[PDB]
């Protein structure tokens, strides 16, 4: 057994799909060599760590094992570490090509305490001749102001649907698996931009049910079927919606958070109703979501949400 996400992980900078201008910027950086300190921010599962890894690889060639220091969340990153080890690595001697430099890749930089982030300031400022820092964070807000001022900020947009679709087409072509278009559409709907989660769900579907079909996807994801949620939200009589929520969703043991999230994600794609009604239904659904997240996930809240949605649609 082998996770398809790891097996088909991009190793060259060109294999990464999605953002085009930032990938082109990184390509020009790897072609030139003068790479500055950079923070990379974005949503989870969109190719941040892979980007900096392929960048360092293409930059250092046969020197990745000597001039690259990677620190993820599983390693100790305190004050003692950033004071001793990072400083001793920045001062290391290494004969590199005239364009290349050493690389310190700090992943999940938002988890590093402020006291540890304060010490890196002069360490990364004084040794700018043989050391360039690359942070990979989910939130660019937990990084202190001096660090944000020093290094350039690079935001990664969420993945669109055509890019994930092309990546999945490449994967299934190189894997020789049977599929149907509605199955790919279900994968796109469930992934909501997470390329890693998309590949993982596709591999799980292929390994469990063989044929990639919407029924098997919605069975393996263990989430409320979008069709039944659409039927519940678009019903005419409120009693019908309440009965559907009672006997189909609430009885099977679905979590209220899952119900609300599926209703949100289905109302977003309901292209039959107008735009204002969609926005207001999403507003009520989000109000119910915030109410549930505050400790009260009672069925009464979902009933009131359905009542408000029916009153709005009428």
């Amino acid at each position: 057994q082998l996770p398809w996400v790891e097996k088909y992980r991009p190793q060259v900078l060109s294999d990464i799909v999605g953002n085009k201008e930032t990938i082109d910027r990184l390509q020009q950086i790897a072609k030139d060599g003068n790479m500055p300190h950079m923070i990379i921010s974005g949503m989870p599962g969109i190719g941040k760590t892979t980007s900096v890894h392929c960048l360092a690889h293409e930059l250092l060639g046969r020197s990745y094992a000597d001039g690259v220091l990677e620190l993820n969340a599983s390693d100790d990153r305190g004050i003692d570490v950033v004071r001793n080890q990072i400083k001793h690595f920045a001062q290391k001697k290494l004969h590199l090509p005239p364009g290349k430099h050493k690389i310190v890749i700090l992943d999940e930089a938002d988890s590093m305490t402020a006291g540890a982030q304060q010490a890196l300031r002069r360490t990364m400022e004084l040794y700018s001749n043989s050391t360039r820092f690359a942070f990979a964070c989910n939130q660019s807000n937990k990084i202190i102001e001096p660090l944000q001022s020093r290094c350039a900020i690079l935001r990664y947009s969420k993945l669109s649907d055509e890019d994930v679709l092309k990546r999945l087409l490449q994967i299934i072509k190189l894997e020789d698996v049977k599929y149907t278009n509605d199955g790919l559409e279900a994968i796109i709907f469930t992934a909501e931009g997470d390329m890693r989660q998309a590949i993982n769900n596709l591999q799980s579907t292929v390994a469990g049910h063989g044929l990639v079909n919407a029924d098997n996807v919605f069975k393996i994801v263990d989430s409320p079927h979008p069709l039944i949620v659409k039927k519940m939200l678009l019903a005419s009589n409120l009693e019908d919606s309440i009965q559907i929520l009672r006997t189909d969703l609430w009885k099977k043991g679905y979590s209220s958070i899952d119900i609300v999230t599926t209703s949100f994600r289905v109302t977003k794609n309901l292209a039959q109703v107008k735009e204002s009604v969609r926005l207001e239904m999403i507003k009520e659904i989000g109000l119910t979501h915030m109410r549930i997240l505050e400790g009260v996930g009672t069925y009464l809240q979902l009933a009131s949400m359905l009542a408000k949605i029916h009153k709005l649609n009428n």
Partner: protein, 255 residues
């Protein structure tokens, strides 16, 4: 590139242990004459110079001059490995990114090879020129270390007075004061206990206690330390070696 072979494995160990407390990173300038290395303190108050000539090396090539920037903590961790009966060998390839330390036993085939990653230090090499010091004396390092450890326990400033063929150490602390008077004399029965003195002008200087405590740790290389004091120049402490020397330049305090 270079290939140096020390006679004993303890010589370089004692050398590095002499000034591993006042210096953290150091540059070693390897020329055809030998090894010369200078380093400033972290507080920029105590300069350390070290010269080991070719005579202390069993074999030494050094085709062309080179610089090796290295730490003293890792070097002290590595040099502590070898036993007494080993032949330390320093090796550095062309364009060195590291340095090899070989420990070969004379009667056995137990070879212990270590590697050390060189550091990058800007070469702010400043030149030293021979100044005519007013006071130039020399005394056994044991008594000097004793007086330093004695006076440093009272205050944080040791005052040295040279006047009328008399050495005077004094310290004024909060819990009291302390003073020590030394008169020069010669001992034909034991030349290793004889305080020399060549006085030209009465000198009065004041140094810190921490710097003196760090300097006196080098009393294991030689047995007679020389002292050169001037009215306006930094004091010079010197420990001679069978093929070189170790010099501590210490700057006085203010009035």
């Amino acid at each position: 590139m270079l290939e140096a072979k020390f006679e004993e494995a303890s010589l370089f160990k004692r050398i590095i242990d002499g000034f591993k407390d006042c210096v953290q990173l150091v540059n070693f300038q390897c020329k055809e004459d030998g090894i010369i290395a200078q380093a400033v303190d972290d507080s920029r108050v105590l300069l350390v110079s070290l010269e080991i000539g070719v005579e202390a090396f069993q074999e030494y090539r050094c085709d062309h001059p080179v610089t090796l920037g290295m730490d003293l903590t890792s070097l002290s961790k590595i040099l502590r490995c070898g036993n007494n009966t080993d032949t330390l060998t320093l090796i550095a390839d062309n364009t060195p990114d590291s340095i090899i330390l070989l420990f070969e036993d004379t009667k056995k085939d137990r070879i212990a090879e270590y590697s050390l990653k060189l550091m990058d230090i800007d070469a702010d090499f400043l030149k030293i020129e021979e100044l005519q010091y007013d006071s130039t004396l020399s005394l056994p390092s044991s008594e000097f270390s004793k007086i330093v450890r004695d006076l440093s326990q009272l205050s944080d400033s040791i005052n040295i007075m040279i006047t009328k063929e008399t050495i005077k150490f004094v310290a004024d602390g909060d819990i009291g004061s302390g003073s020590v008077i030394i008169k020069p004399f010669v001992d034909m029965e034991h030349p290793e206990t004889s305080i020399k003195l060549e006085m030209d002008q009465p000198v009065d200087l004041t140094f810190g206690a921490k710097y003196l405590l760090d300097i006196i740790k080098g009393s294991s290389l030689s047995d007679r330390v020389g002292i050169r004091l001037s009215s306006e120049a930094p004091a010079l402490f010197q420990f001679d070696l069978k093929s070189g020397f170790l010099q501590f330049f210490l700057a006085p305090k203010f009035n």
